[PDB]
Every structure is written in structure tokens, then in C-alpha cells.
């Protein structure tokens, strides 16, 4: 019944883009694929580095859809392989919106974070 000291995190970006034009939402969302990567590497990973046992994440991937809705729901997911279990899902989510302390202007409202697998080693 071995015990797990790290957990695996899926960090997600969730953006709604205007599509008054009624184009493919894969193509509308693709517009800010590069933005999302640059945001992942320059802000999101850095501010979660503190919590990882070992540096290590998957390449951020967009979720394919099949629609042309007036508002496009765009979602990217990346996986961070090992984060100390000591840091709960809530504290990791907070780390996304707040850095400097007592802060009131939240950042990255578009970003969220789950535990993808409770049972990882470091």
C-alpha cells in the first residue's frame, strides 16, 4: 500500500472569442494558440515552478471542437508531471491569480488547474 508524495496537475486556459462571422471554432481558437503557449511558458509554468518536485510538463494542446457558434469556447490543457502533494488543488489554483501578496487585481482569470492523477512519485 505504498504512499505517494507528489500529484499530477493539468493546467487549462478557457477563453471565449467573438465569432460574429460564424467561422470554424477550431480556426477562431487557433488565432491565439501561440499567445496561449507564450503565456504558458512566460507566466503560468514560472509561477508554478515553485511547487514542482522536478521541472516537467507536456506541450500545451488545444481541444478540437466541431462548431461555428457565435461565441467560440476555446480550451488548452498542459500536464505538469510532478507537484508535491503538500500543495492542494486550491492553493495551486490561487497561485494562478495571485503572486505579490494582499493583491486585489487577480490575473489569469482564463486559467484553471486540476489534479489529473492523485498518485505520482518525485
Amino acid at each position: 500500500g505504498h504512499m505517494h508524495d507528489c500529484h499530477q496537475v493539468t493546467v487549462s486556459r478557457d477563453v471565449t472569442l467573438q465569432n460574429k462571422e460564424r467561422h470554424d471554432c477550431n480556426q477562431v481558437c487557433a488565432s491565439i494558440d501561440k499567445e496561449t503557449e507564450n503565456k504558458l511558458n512566460t507566466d503560468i509554468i514560472p509561477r508554478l515552478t515553485r511547487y514542482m518536485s522536478v521541472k516537467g510538463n507536456s506541450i500545451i494542446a488545444r481541444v478540437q471542437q466541431s462548431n461555428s457558434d457565435p461565441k467560440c469556447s476555446c480550451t488548452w490543457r498542459a500536464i505538469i508531471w510532478r507537484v508535491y502533494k503538500a500543495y492542494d488543488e486550491n492553493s495551486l489554483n490561487v497561485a494562478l491569480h495571485v503572486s505579490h501578496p494582499n493583491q486585489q487585481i487577480g490575473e489569469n482569470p482564463d486559467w484553471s488547474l486540476v489534479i489529473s492523477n492523485p498518485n505520482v512519485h518525485c
Side-chain angles (χ1 to χ4, degrees):
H2 77 318
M3 292 170 171
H4 295 98
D5 59 320
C6 282
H7 51 199
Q8 166 180 108
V9 172
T10 302
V11 65
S12 307
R13 188 198 188 188
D14 279 288
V15 187
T16 297
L17 289 168
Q18 261 37 248
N19 185 31
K20 44 151 187 186
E21 295 85 359
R22 305 306 304 279
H23 294 157
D24 189 20
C25 283
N26 291 325
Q27 197 159 307
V28 170
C29 299
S31 76
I32 58 152
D33 277 359
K34 269 168 210 188
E35 159 168 287
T36 313
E37 206 173 21
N38 293 351
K39 237 285 144 88
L40 179 81
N41 291 122
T42 67
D43 183 15
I44 302 292
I45 295 306
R47 73 161 54 208
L48 289 172
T49 286
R50 200 188 122 186
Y51 308 109
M52 295 146 99
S53 108
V54 180
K55 300 217 159 108
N57 64 268
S58 70
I59 298 284
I60 195 154
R62 201 212 315 121
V63 172
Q64 290 336 94
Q65 54 210 295
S66 214
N67 75 95
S68 304
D69 296 342
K71 299 180 172 157
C72 290
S73 278
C74 312
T75 315
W76 303 253
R77 306 216 143 100
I79 306 197
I80 300 169
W81 299 126
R82 18 211 112 223
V83 167
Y84 298 105
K85 224 149 151 195
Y87 303 119
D88 59 337
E89 195 149 14
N90 178 67
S91 274
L92 287 166
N93 269 289
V94 159
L96 285 186
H97 313 302
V98 189
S99 25
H100 329 130
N102 275 328
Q103 160 179 354
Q104 304 206 280
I105 309 160
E107 330 160 62
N108 311 328
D110 43 319
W111 290 85
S112 80
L113 171 154
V114 300
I115 307 304
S116 349
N117 173 6
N119 303 311
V120 172
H121 305 274
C122 322

